[PDB]
Each structure stands twice: as structure tokens, then as C-alpha cells.
Design a protein around this nucleic acid. Structure first.
Ligand SMILES: [Mg+2]
Length: 49
RNA sequence: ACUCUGGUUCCUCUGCAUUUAACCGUGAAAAUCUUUCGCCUUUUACUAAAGAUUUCCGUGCAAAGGAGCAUACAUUGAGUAAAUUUUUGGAGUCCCCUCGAAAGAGCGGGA
């Protein structure tokens, strides 16, 4: 178990630490389109076209 | 006669471990993506199968450098040490006829 959880927590605790020290840069990351958000996204791209 | 090198043990770097039936691992994790099943008023954390990739705990060999211990020159690639029938301890010598200036050559002949 620990063999495989070691790199997973190394990444996760890295991400935890990095936003704890660097702050969270994530403003303007591309939000993806998902179940509820499809129908509003169709209306965006329709009205834009 | 030439150049070629001290044993061991350990550290670390570098390179290679794909023609896999199968196996660097007689052991066995986690993730991502794509798809298909089951949970479910959502997502996460999930179910349990396929396919494709990753990370992680490890493996082998070669080669180079260093560090500790006790100590030995040989030895690798290139290359050393029989008088009794079948070989290396003598069936060897000599003399006529032939062709040819020349010196050999005939299962030639003779002692
Ligand atoms: Mg919502």
C-alpha cells in the first residue's frame, strides 16, 4: 500500500504546501463544461456566433 | 624475448538491461485517460473489468572514480621444450645403353 500511496501523497502534500507558501494562482484557469453547465454554455456560444 | 595487473569489502557517478512465448521482481502498489458495468437526487471518495500511459518500492550487469582493511607476483590478451619393421639416427654407394656440345632421365640394366 505505502509503495503506491507514497508518490500520491508526495504530490498531494506538495500541492498543499505550495499553495500554502506560494498562494493559490488559480484565477483564470479554464473552467471545463460539465452536466449542469452545458445548457448555459450552449447559450454563450450561440449568442457569440 | 613484450605491455599487462596487487587482493578483498564498501560508497558514488555513468551507460545498458524491447526480437519479451515467458522472466530485469519465484514478489506485487497508487494514479491519470478512454470505455463498459453498480452505487446515486451532485461532486469527491468508490464498485470491477478492458485498453493505453505514468509514478513509486525494488533488480541485474559493465565501466570509471574514491574510501577502508589486512599484503602478494605469479598470471591474463599475445606465444616454449623417443638409435630395432610405419616417419627424427641411413638399403646406402658405385658401373654400362640411350638423347645431347652442356646435364640429367627411362618401374633401363649390373655389383
Ligand atoms: Mg451546483
Amino acid at each position: 500500500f505505502l509503495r503506491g500511496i507514497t508518490p500520491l501523497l508526495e504530490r498531494w502534500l506538495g500541492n498543499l504546501l505550495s499553495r500554502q507558501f506560494e498562494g493559490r494562482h488559480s484565477k483564470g484557469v479554464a473552467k471545463t463544461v460539465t452536466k449542469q453547465r452545458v445548457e448555459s454554455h450552449f447559450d454563450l456560444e450561440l449568442r457569440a456566433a
